[PDB]
Design a protein around this ligand. Sequence first.
Ligand SMILES: *[C@@H]1O[C@H](CO)[C@@H](O[C@@H]2O[C@H](CO)[C@@H](O)[C@H](O)[C@H]2NC(C)=O)[C@H](O)[C@H]1NC(C)=O
Ligand SMILES: *[C@@H]1O[C@H](CO)[C@@H](O[C@@H]2O[C@H](CO)[C@@H](O)[C@H](O)[C@H]2NC(C)=O)[C@H](O)[C@H]1NC(C)=O
Ligand SMILES: *[C@@H]1O[C@H](CO)[C@@H](O[C@@H]2O[C@H](CO)[C@@H](O)[C@H](O)[C@H]2NC(C)=O)[C@H](O)[C@H]1NC(C)=O
Ligand SMILES: *[C@@H]1O[C@H](CO)[C@@H](O[C@@H]2O[C@H](CO)[C@@H](O)[C@H](O)[C@H]2NC(C)=O)[C@H](O)[C@H]1NC(C)=O
Ligand SMILES: CC(C)CCC[C@@H](C)[C@H]1CC[C@H]2[C@@H]3CC=C4C[C@@H](O)CC[C@]4(C)[C@H]3CC[C@]12C
Ligand SMILES: *[C@@H]1O[C@H](CO)[C@@H](O)[C@H](O)[C@H]1NC(C)=O
Ligand SMILES: *[C@@H]1O[C@H](CO)[C@@H](O)[C@H](O)[C@H]1NC(C)=O
Ligand SMILES: *[C@@H]1O[C@H](CO)[C@@H](O)[C@H](O)[C@H]1NC(C)=O
Ligand SMILES: *[C@@H]1O[C@H](CO)[C@@H](O)[C@H](O)[C@H]1NC(C)=O
Ligand SMILES: *[C@@H]1O[C@H](CO)[C@@H](O)[C@H](O)[C@H]1NC(C)=O
Ligand SMILES: *[C@@H]1O[C@H](CO)[C@@H](O)[C@H](O)[C@H]1NC(C)=O
Ligand SMILES: *[C@@H]1O[C@H](CO)[C@@H](O)[C@H](O)[C@H]1NC(C)=O
Ligand SMILES: *[C@@H]1O[C@H](CO)[C@@H](O)[C@H](O)[C@H]1NC(C)=O
Ligand SMILES: *[C@@H]1O[C@H](CO)[C@@H](O)[C@H](O)[C@H]1NC(C)=O
Ligand SMILES: *[C@@H]1O[C@H](CO)[C@@H](O)[C@H](O)[C@H]1NC(C)=O
Length: 1234
Amino acid sequence: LYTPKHEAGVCTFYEECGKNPELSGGLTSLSNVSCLSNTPARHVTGEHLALLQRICPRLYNGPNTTFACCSTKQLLSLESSMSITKALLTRCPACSDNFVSLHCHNTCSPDQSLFINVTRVVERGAGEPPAVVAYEAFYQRSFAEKAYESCSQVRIPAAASLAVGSMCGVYGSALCNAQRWLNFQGDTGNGLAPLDITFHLLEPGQALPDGIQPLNGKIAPCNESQGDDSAVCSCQDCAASCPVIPPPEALRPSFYMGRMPGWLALIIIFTAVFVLLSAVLVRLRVVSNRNKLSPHTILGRFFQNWGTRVASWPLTVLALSFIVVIALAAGLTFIELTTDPVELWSAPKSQARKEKSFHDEHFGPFFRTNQIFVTARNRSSYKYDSLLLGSKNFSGILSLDFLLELLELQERLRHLQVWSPEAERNISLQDICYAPLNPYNTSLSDCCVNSLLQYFQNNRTLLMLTANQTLNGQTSLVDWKDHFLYCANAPLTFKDGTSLALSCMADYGAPVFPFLAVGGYQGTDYSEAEALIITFSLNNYPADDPRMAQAKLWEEAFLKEMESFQRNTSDKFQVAFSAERSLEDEINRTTIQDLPVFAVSYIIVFLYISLALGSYSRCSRVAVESKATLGLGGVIVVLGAVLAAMGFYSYLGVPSSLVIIQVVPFLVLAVGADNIFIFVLEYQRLPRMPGEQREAHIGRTLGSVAPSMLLCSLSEAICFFLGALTPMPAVRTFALTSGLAIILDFLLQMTAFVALLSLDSKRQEASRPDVLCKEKEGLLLRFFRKIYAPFLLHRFIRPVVMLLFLTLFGANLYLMCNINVGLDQELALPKDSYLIDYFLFLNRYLEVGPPVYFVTTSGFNFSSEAGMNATCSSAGCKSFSLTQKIQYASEFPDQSYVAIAASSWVDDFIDWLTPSSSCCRLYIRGPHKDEFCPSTDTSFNCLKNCMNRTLGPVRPTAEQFHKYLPWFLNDPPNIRCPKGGLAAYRTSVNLSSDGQVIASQFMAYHKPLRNSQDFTEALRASRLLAANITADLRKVPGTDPNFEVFPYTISNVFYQQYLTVLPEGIFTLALCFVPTFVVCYLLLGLDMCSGILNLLSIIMILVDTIGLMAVWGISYNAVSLINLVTAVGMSVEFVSHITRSFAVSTKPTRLERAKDATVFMGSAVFAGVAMTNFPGILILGFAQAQLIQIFFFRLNLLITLLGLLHGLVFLPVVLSYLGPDVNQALVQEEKLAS
Ligand SMILES: *[C@@H]1O[C@H](CO)[C@@H](O[C@@H]2O[C@H](CO)[C@@H](O)[C@H](O)[C@H]2NC(C)=O)[C@H](O)[C@H]1NC(C)=O
Ligand SMILES: *[C@@H]1O[C@H](CO)[C@@H](O[C@@H]2O[C@H](CO)[C@@H](O)[C@H](O)[C@H]2NC(C)=O)[C@H](O)[C@H]1NC(C)=O
Ligand SMILES: *[C@@H]1O[C@H](CO)[C@@H](O[C@@H]2O[C@H](CO)[C@@H](O)[C@H](O)[C@H]2NC(C)=O)[C@H](O)[C@H]1NC(C)=O
Ligand SMILES: *[C@@H]1O[C@H](CO)[C@@H](O[C@@H]2O[C@H](CO)[C@@H](O)[C@H](O)[C@H]2NC(C)=O)[C@H](O)[C@H]1NC(C)=O
Ligand SMILES: CC(C)CCC[C@@H](C)[C@H]1CC[C@H]2[C@@H]3CC=C4C[C@@H](O)CC[C@]4(C)[C@H]3CC[C@]12C
Ligand SMILES: *[C@@H]1O[C@H](CO)[C@@H](O)[C@H](O)[C@H]1NC(C)=O
Ligand SMILES: *[C@@H]1O[C@H](CO)[C@@H](O)[C@H](O)[C@H]1NC(C)=O
Ligand SMILES: *[C@@H]1O[C@H](CO)[C@@H](O)[C@H](O)[C@H]1NC(C)=O
Ligand SMILES: *[C@@H]1O[C@H](CO)[C@@H](O)[C@H](O)[C@H]1NC(C)=O
Ligand SMILES: *[C@@H]1O[C@H](CO)[C@@H](O)[C@H](O)[C@H]1NC(C)=O
Ligand SMILES: *[C@@H]1O[C@H](CO)[C@@H](O)[C@H](O)[C@H]1NC(C)=O
Ligand SMILES: *[C@@H]1O[C@H](CO)[C@@H](O)[C@H](O)[C@H]1NC(C)=O
Ligand SMILES: *[C@@H]1O[C@H](CO)[C@@H](O)[C@H](O)[C@H]1NC(C)=O
Ligand SMILES: *[C@@H]1O[C@H](CO)[C@@H](O)[C@H](O)[C@H]1NC(C)=O
Ligand SMILES: *[C@@H]1O[C@H](CO)[C@@H](O)[C@H](O)[C@H]1NC(C)=O
């Protein structure tokens, strides 16, 4: 009751012996089943051989050598049955015969027993061969897979769907393969197969069942011609024959010019200047060796007369100064603050602003996104064995119980209402939500909400349904798991192929894509996803519109609800969430948190002054000698000047921000306090002779020190005003406020402070204690005189320090090239914000990046044949058409940051117009003849197509195009016509009143972006692609000479600043060095040496700062730019005072001159500037924010240390060698004054 032998040359059945008894109720033509006959093969000749050779030549083995195991009647039945599939595959016959070969071999092969094992026996009649209902067959995997592939992409004659999609049963082309297709052909459950055939795809490598040889015969590839027919399958039908497009080439690294690396040009260009100026100084010294009224007196006399008159009348000047300061400060009532960080940290005018304006004008603003993530805390991944797909792995988060809870949370969020005080009413979701369909007369069901549960239309009942169905020999149950797996691989469908014939589209009328519902998966293993995503979209608006405020109120309630849920579900799963406004609020909160800490930092500075300028008598006599009055005076005058500058700018109408308020007084005080300290110290050091009154003494003191304060003030203020060139509002506002504040500080110091000091001296001479309650040499003068100066200036020390500092400069000059560029949001957040968890979840689980739009401007004719030819990607299109270029670019996501190929309204429009789709029809009779008749009208009053049937590509005329396009754009999709533009293209085409297109867009997605370098590189690659597209579209005749396309995305406005060669601050910082040289040169009497030495010192300090900044891993950005401008200003306090003090000296030799300047001015500068700056920085270590600790604490400590090391060590030595000569006029004036 089986076939004992299965070796070779013997078959298992020959003659047809009647109809199949087991199958009943088919009511269709079927081949008569043969009964078992295990006999040798029959010789086939004559007309039987003629038919056998005719149908499938592969079995022909010579005119009188052919054997076969089939009859002519069986062949006629075979031809009749096969004719339907043969008709279907008409597009490329070459592979179709291969399919036919598969059947005829199975029917007639003389070596039938080597691959067919009969397994079913039915006894038709006594003493007759028993009928065979079913059997099994053996094949090799590679044979069947290649045979499948030969027609796997072949289209039907209509050219829309794939032929394979009509031959894989329950599912279409999306989920079919060789095994499933072969199983379909042999399974009688479809009402078509005549008998049950089991198809085993035995692997060729491992031979497991012995005695059976799986087969593998001749298979014709697509591009292999069948002799001289020269009718290979076009690559539109099987894709194997299409030409290969070479991969994108590697590009050179950025920042290059000419034939060399860019930065290398900079260093030589920089270094040469450093060499050149140095040479000049040496030349001057050599000339000296070979050869061997002044402004100081005018300024001295002027300031002495000014100071004595001011000191005489202290109450009047103090009153007038106070009144002026209050009069300016009062302006703060008009203050307006900007809080949006993108407006603060981005240029107001650029290419991106133009593109944003155009996009917003023609298509409307980009929507707001509110998003949550959830992943399971503890579960174990399990397995499920489905009838359709086999054994699949499911993650813990995809458990049935969890989904119901998530459905409840989503349902609570949709209904939610908020109280609006201005509107005095409850704002609902449908008042502000974004909806792609029905923007007016909307309802709650239309609002755009993306989630996994959209595959079940949020219907709890549908999620819980199960059903029984039978697939070949197995009957079993199906549930939600199968439906989700089916929808994931085929997002657009109006019904499944299972018993649960539900649609997979969202309730609001659009398909939901897997990368928007789940995340944390590789490949196409959607069931293994780890995180679930729920996203709400809200409409944006102009700022003036009141509705935005209402929208913001809704977001507040959203955040509250999530926090409540987070508490309730603390142990089950872990959630992460964010709202659109959250970042704007979160950063601002941080600023408020650190406002008292800075405040503490100012008062500590006060205390230092009171001790530094004080005295004692053996111990603990602070109550009398400590200068509390002068400390309070200095601090109040400087902070008054700062408030006056802010008030003035508020009067003018310039906005400000919390950052400016936070950091301007600190940076201003750090320089302004030092003029006060130096002046007071000089006053204490200078004795007076009997007869002199204190007013003359104070006058003479101001005459002594006022030109140094004037020179330093002018240099600092001009440098700060030159800082205000970068377009970024924060930096421009900072620079202008600091520039005005320093000037007002200077003017106040020369009036109110002098008066206060005069009154303090008056109180001191009368031996009265301060209102709080022997002129011995100071330790600093003794220490510098006896220990420091004889040591530093020693003959065996100077070349060592010179070589050490020049080597340090060289090494830092090299190191300064390794700069990290960019600002990351992660720093700007508090150490415990929920946004940290949100960003970490985005970085690990989200599979796609931001969307990008390629927007097409006016000036292009889409109504012509050439226009369509160059844009869409159908059978008759250009090989490198726009859509094809984007699709190609999407295949190499690492070279060009595009992950998902763009859609195209033109291809869907042309496809929709096709007569065979029954989508564009018109009424044929009655009151509405020649009007549009929608596809949902099932009457018989419409039998006429929009277009007449033709051959080849479908192209409308201009009249048809302009008449029918507004109908296409408003057709909702349905089961009768899956294509249409209402659910996807409604707002992507802007039409004119005469039917012309003004603008259009093509939408695509980026690959995941994780840091600022990926956003920058994505912008570079996308702009390069858009440039190539415009460059080729401009060759089409008839277009406007100024037609272009551009890549809009929401993030471009901020990130565009990093695309240049010099990262914006280099030009301004380089420019800021000029006022040092110019002011120093002019004020000191046209002294070339002082100017050159000051400029070189400032340059060396800034290069060292940038080098060490690179070595300590601090990135370059606008905040670093602010601090570097401050450093350029501050270093003048370390250089200028010593330079001027050395220059104005009457000692006969340079070495002698250096010593006195070093001891007196060195000790005053050290005690003032260094000790002023260190306590106001060390306090900031407790700021509790990463932004402040990285860019203010460490960077200012670095700047201060480099300042002191260059100022007090290098500068005296270089002055000792190359300093200026003696001013002879001063010598003559000194001698005559006798
Ligand atoms: C299609 O583009 C035109 C471009 O002009 C849009 O017309 C502008 O619409 C805005 C908003 O209503 C107005 O402020 C402008 O004044 C309009 N411009 C002109 C010249 O009238 C038009 O709105 C766009 N279509 C859609 C549906 O937004
Ligand atoms: C959620 O799904 C259920 C299941 O189909 C819907 O219930 C059916 O609705 C149709 C249309 O009104 C009725 O004819 C059936 O009798 C309902 N069946 C049952 C068991 O009630 C339900 O309407 C869906 N929810 C919504 C809001 O439409
Ligand atoms: C799906 O099939 C199962 C199995 O036949 C049905 O469950 C019942 O199972 C018991 C065995 O425990 C049988 O004795 C019953 O005859 C089965 N009932 C029926 C109606 O077949 C289950 O009810 C079926 N479900 C659906 C929706 O068809
Ligand atoms: C795009 O090109 C087509 C084809 O030339 C233009 O259609 C012609 O338009 C002119 C005037 O608009 C008519 O007189 C012709 O009869 C049209 N048909 C032809 C030549 O077959 C169409 O106008 C162009 N669109 C634009 C915006 O210029
Ligand atoms: C002060 C500085 C740091 C502000 C930085 C602003 C930038 C980097 C922020 C502001 C708005 C943000 C975008 C808001 C919306 C989304 C959609 C989301 O699906 C992908 C991320 C994306 C596209 C964000 C990218 C980053 C973004 C552009
Ligand atoms: C099968 O055999 C019967 C008996 O000769 C015949 O009438 C019938 O036409 C055959 N073919 C079929 C059912 O396709
Ligand atoms: C072939 O079929 C017979 C029954 O017809 C069965 O007993 C035998 O095990 C089968 N052989 C293989 C290798 O499956
Ligand atoms: C047909 O295409 C395949 C693709 O792998 C290629 O290897 C083969 O050489 C091609 N044959 C011809 C004749 O072009
Ligand atoms: C899984 O997590 C829960 C949550 O606390 C815990 O109680 C349970 O013990 C965990 N399972 C194992 C095996 O540790
Ligand atoms: C998932 O299923 C496949 C096939 O059933 C199996 O090989 C794999 O080990 C499974 N993974 C887990 C984690 O169970
Ligand atoms: C808004 O909804 C709350 C919910 O109970 C209700 O108490 C309140 O009265 C509503 N507001 C208005 C204006 O109806
Ligand atoms: C979580 O919320 C639900 C409904 O608001 C409530 O029934 C449940 O008790 C809450 N959980 C806890 C732990 O209170
Ligand atoms: C459009 O494409 C077809 C097919 O390549 C070509 O024959 C035709 O010349 C092209 N141009 C126009 C204006 O139809
Ligand atoms: C189709 O052909 C008929 C007969 O030639 C003609 O009357 C009709 O206008 C044609 N329609 C189109 C859209 O070309
Ligand atoms: C556009 O890209 C292609 C990529 O192969 C390149 O060969 C071509 O030079 C680019 N530029 C154009 C067409 O201006």
